[PDB]
């Protein structure tokens, strides 16, 4: 990476909007972190709940569909750690809720496995499919832990 790209990525990880504003260009907004997993600034801002930076990035050309080395999109990252506002923002900017990574995990597999009730609810409201099997043959419902009966209820979708 160029020193400037490195600086932008750290600024995104940190939620440093003022620095992001300084460095963010057409050329850099979707740069990849070569030293990590080819994460974009938006991947980092999403995983670390940097809401103001996610807003800025999304308004300035950031790619919600960018895949990292594992095939993860920034929505996977937000969903894994329960970042509701970030997830909501990504979906508003056209994130596809059923997109799958290299292990065929969707963001709903992730939210389910991580026990994130509101994230699961948000994804389902936007048409996420709780029946999609990953590489292991597991659906998101399969990945819900025994005691998370609320998330089970949600993904099972009993008639209502």
């Amino acid at each position: 990476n160029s020193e400037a790209d490195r600086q932008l990525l750290e600024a995104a990880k940190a939620g440093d909007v003022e620095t992001v504003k300084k460095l963010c260009t057409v050329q850099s907004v979707n740069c990849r972190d070569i030293e990590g997993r080819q994460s974009t600034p938006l991947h980092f801002a999403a995983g670390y709940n940097r809401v103001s930076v996610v807003e800025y990035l999304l308004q300035h050309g950031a790619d919600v569909h960018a895949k990292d080395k594992g095939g993860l999109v920034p929505l996977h990252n937000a969903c894994s750690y329960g970042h509701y506002e970030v997830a909501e923002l990504l979906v508003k900017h056209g994130a596809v809720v059923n997109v799958a990574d290299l292990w065929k995990f969707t963001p709903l597999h992730e939210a389910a496995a991580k026990g994130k009730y509101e994230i699961c609810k948000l994804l389902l409201q936007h048409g996420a499919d709780p029946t999609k099997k990953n590489r292991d043959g597991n659906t998101p419902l399969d990945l819900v832990k025994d005691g998370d009966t609320d998330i089970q209820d949600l993904l099972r979708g009993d008639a209502a």
Partner: peptide
């Protein structure tokens, strides 16, 4: 090849 945890953390709003 195992799937690694996604990049991120449980950073409070």
């Amino acid at each position: 090849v195992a799937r690694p945890p996604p990049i991120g953390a449980e950073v409070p709003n």
